[PDB]
Amino acid sequence: GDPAPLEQMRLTEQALEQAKAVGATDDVAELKLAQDKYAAAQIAMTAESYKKARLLAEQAELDARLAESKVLTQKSKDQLGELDKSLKRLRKQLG
Amino acid sequence: PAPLEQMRLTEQALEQAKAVGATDDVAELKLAQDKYAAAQIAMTAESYKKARLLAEQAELDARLAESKVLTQKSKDQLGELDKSLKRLRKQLGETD
Amino acid sequence: GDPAPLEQMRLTEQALEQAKAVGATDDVAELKLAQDKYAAAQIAMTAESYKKARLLAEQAELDARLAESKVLTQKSKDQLGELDKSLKRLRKQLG
Amino acid sequence: PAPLEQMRLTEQALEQAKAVGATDDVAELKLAQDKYAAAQIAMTAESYKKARLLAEQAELDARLAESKVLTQKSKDQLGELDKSLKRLRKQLGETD
Incomplete structure (x- = not known):
């Protein structure tokens, strides 16, 4: 796809930092999923498959x-x- | 004679308050620490009725x-x- | 004793109304105690035993x-x- | 075919929200009720993919x-x- 979802990545990174700051770790199932999807989104970014990258980044957020x-x-x-x-x-x- | 178990109970409550984050800046903890100090002054003086009541107030x-x-x-x-x-x-609600 | 603890009665009544307003009934042990001690405070009030009435009304509050x-x-x-x-x-x- | 279980799940969700005190004044409940009405319009039209999607969004x-x-x-x-x-x-603390 196109264009680079740089603002979505920024939003996903912000949600990841908010969850880690309140005490969430890889032991929280949803944070492990979020970190895995955010990694897969970066793999799609490098491949310049930006529609796929945006959709994994939205899911990770x-x-x-x-x-x-x-x-x-x-x-x-x-x-x-x-x-x-x-x-x-x-x-x-x-009493 | 001495209210030794009350003194211990007063120390337990002081440690519980400090453990949840209370400091000398919490007015009630400063009062508790002052009334406990006064209870120890009465303990040394062997005025055990005064010591018990101040330890109770501090608790x-x-x-x-x-x-x-x-x-x-x-x-x-x-x-x-x-x-x-x-x-x-x-x-x-990004789409709403 | 003396004088009439009219301001204490007023604070006791106020505490009773605040407790009933949040849903406390005779089934909450502390409210049953408060109502009993307040009744006893009024019996002492009528008897003009104001030291006894103040101490009961303080306990009820x-x-x-x-x-x-x-x-x-x-x-x-x-x-x-x-x-x-x-x-x-x-x-x-x-999910 | 017809998303009958989704329609019932969407109704259940709407009743739960109204039961905790949410009214048409809750923006998300007004959206849910509008999306559910649109889901029923699609149901009567027998456009069941559209009906399911709107019902899921309303839920x-x-x-x-x-x-x-x-x-x-x-x-x-x-x-x-x-x-x-x-x-x-x-x-x-009347005495403090």
Whole structure:
């Protein structure tokens, strides 16, 4: 295809960095998928098959955003869980 | 005679508050550390009723500092999740 | 004792209304305690034993605030739990 | 042939979004309802590839509306918990 999807690549890279920054690793299935698709997109970029490159980069961006909100949901439940245990200990002291 | 187990319970709550991220900058943790220092002053003086009550007050303020910091951390994580889902909707609504 | 703890009663009533407003009922142990101690505070008020009435009303206020944050913690965990199930269904659709 | 199971899955998603509090005022729910109406127009026309695709897009927008509303409801409850604990600390710090 054509032209080079350089702005899509930039968007995909941004989503990958956002997911890694919140704590997502290769152990998060969606981040492993995102990194694999982003690598395949670069392989299509070198081949100058830009329609294929754009479609793998779009898919990689989505999987990276799914990994990010997956990790943040677990992190939010864990903090709220620790707040709950804290508040049970406070009531036990005051009761 | 000495309220040794309460003193230990007060130390446990002080460590729990510091472990979730509370510092001397959290007003309730500074109060807890001051009331615990005063409890140790009373311990050395062998004024064990005064020591027990100050250790109890210090334990409460340490638990209040812990829940104060955990509420802010819970709001921040939920805030980051909200920004994340706004970016997801923007991507998926690119054609809308 | 003396004087009438009218401002304390007012703070106790305010805490009771705040706890009931977030969904706390007689089934939340701390709200049942708060309502019982408040009733006992009013019996002491009529008896003009204002030291006893203040101490009961203070205890009732605390238990009402503990019931309020107990219910709000459970409501916050339930909403975050529903958000988690929703995002699992979203990932299932997109995967 | 006819995407009958997809149409039911799209209806289920729309009912779930409305059940958590989303209305026509949720932009993603308004989109989902518009795309579902267009999917029914294609169903009656017996253009089942068009019907399936619009129904799948409507399902996605309904799931996006649902998690959008649940994020705001989670932030509001956590916000109410924060105000509640500020009042508790104020009461217990009356002597501080």
